[model samples]
Target: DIQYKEVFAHYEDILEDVVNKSFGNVLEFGVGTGNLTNKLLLAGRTVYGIEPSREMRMIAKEKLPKEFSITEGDFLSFEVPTSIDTIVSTYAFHHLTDDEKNVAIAKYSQLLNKGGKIVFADTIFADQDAYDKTVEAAKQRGFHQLANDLQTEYYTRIPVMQTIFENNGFHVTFTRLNHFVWVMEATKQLEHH
Candidate 1:
């Protein structure tokens, strides 16, 4: 790896592309060192972050804005203080197992407002064409690490996630680049007043 900072910097670009620049209350999951969380706080959202590690939580706490709050727990089971207009996560959602992701999305209706949104950057396996090409390219070159990853189901999980969110009343959209990266957004459908 180049360094953690380089990875973090790329995330800033990914967040900008996938996430809306302006929005209300934002909560981030696995807020590591507050990279995305700190940026979101500065961007004018009432930001809340969830981190499982006390060490990381401390780093985030020190770096965050005064308006920001840090919560300690599993994001899937945390008690959100209020209805959120936007729930933001970056590179963290992929940590959950497929079953856990399902349970997490199911909780969205409980924490978000009628028309809330979730924007996040993560990894997903490619489709058959891209997957084959990526795998072949890696094997042909010396990128054993990347080629090996392409062999897994990680890239194929987005369709499952999209279907899960759609079944739960959220409109889902995603875009992935050649680097095995994906940015996905799911917006809760608004009720007719």
Candidate 2:
């Protein structure tokens, strides 16, 4: 059910390196079709995925091997079984509202093990030009029609995101992956609970 070679070949090596080094229980907030989950499995880590869409979760369950676990829920509200070591999400943060994003960061910080990590790879509004270009591109791709007003509300700048993370007690670093996409690696600060 997966076209691995065609789908994720470009970032396979980078993903492999990251998952291999991560510690404790790992969770992916949005598994999409489980391509990344499969990769994590191959890396020999026991990973769990949270997917809110039933169709998406079903597709992932069918495609992903039996060894992995996939849960259906809104990650911001879902209850994790244990303290998570590393949490990762790709292209999903934009779906959250600004308030939701802040709550999510704080929630993740509380759910994390000390010294845990959170990695988010998604579109960021680096500047007005970039946001306009992204919206134009989305329109051309027919995404504008498909996207709801809530979804389109995401035009979060990097500084805003960085401040959110920092304020939530994460030592954050941002990396621009492309003209529209950026990645954040945030380490949960080790402090007395």
Candidate 3:
């Protein structure tokens, strides 16, 4: 029931800009239906996407170009053959539990090439009151049922998110991407050894 095209239209330009600036092999976590994948491919990046939902993965395959590669599995546990230069996720971070979110970022830091960048965008918990307001708004938009089910799905606080990234050896660059979405850009610290 989610209108994929409408969602894509709102994010296409920002997605394109981010991918255009990314170099080397790129990996996208939670690539549902390949909306972002299509944009990445057009940017000439060799992209690999990880999706946990079997149904979503199938939809992604159907929507993506033949040249794009997609892996079917949970990103939290999936292993890549080699380190990548950039890692990205959109609107998927909020599904992770706090502990799982920390683990995910840590894994990315360890899996990325030295100096690699991770760019992710997702909704953050606006203050308690604001979050309530947003939830009500979401309900009006037909997302209420899912929103209610995900009351504690992920961290909504910026400070908490920043600490998680810092603990994993990434320096947070930007904490906000837009009004409702938070974007974090972090670089893996180079290892001396």
Candidate closest to the true structure, highest TM-score: 3
lDDT of 2 by residue, 38-152 (tens): 7777777678889989889988989888756777867587758576788887767888877889999998887786688888777677766766665665556545443343245
Residue 159 of model 2 has an lDDT of 82
Off by over 4 Å in 1: 2-9, 18-22, 128-156, 190-193
What local distance difference test score does each model get? Answer: 0.70, 0.72, 0.74
RMSD of each: 3.5, 4.3, 3.2
- Predicted structure with the largest lDDT when compared to the true one: 3
lDDT of 1 by residue, 41-158 (tens): 5566677778888999888778876656777876587758675777777777767777777788878755676778877787665456765876787778766665665565344557
Instruction: Give the TM-scores of the predictions, in the order they appear.
Output: 0.80, 0.81, 0.82
The digit string of per-residue lDDT tens for model 3 on 114-174 reads 7888887776754667677766766677675555644656647677888998898888766
Q: What number of clashing residue pairs does each candidate have, in the order they appear?
A: 3, 0, 1
Global CA lDDT computed for model 2:
0.72
Give residue 3's error in model 1 in angstroms. Answer: 10
Q: How does residue 24 of candidate 3 score in lDDT? A: 80
lDDT (Cα, 0-100) at 78 in candidate 2: 76
Ranking of candidates on lDDT, top first: 3, 2, 1
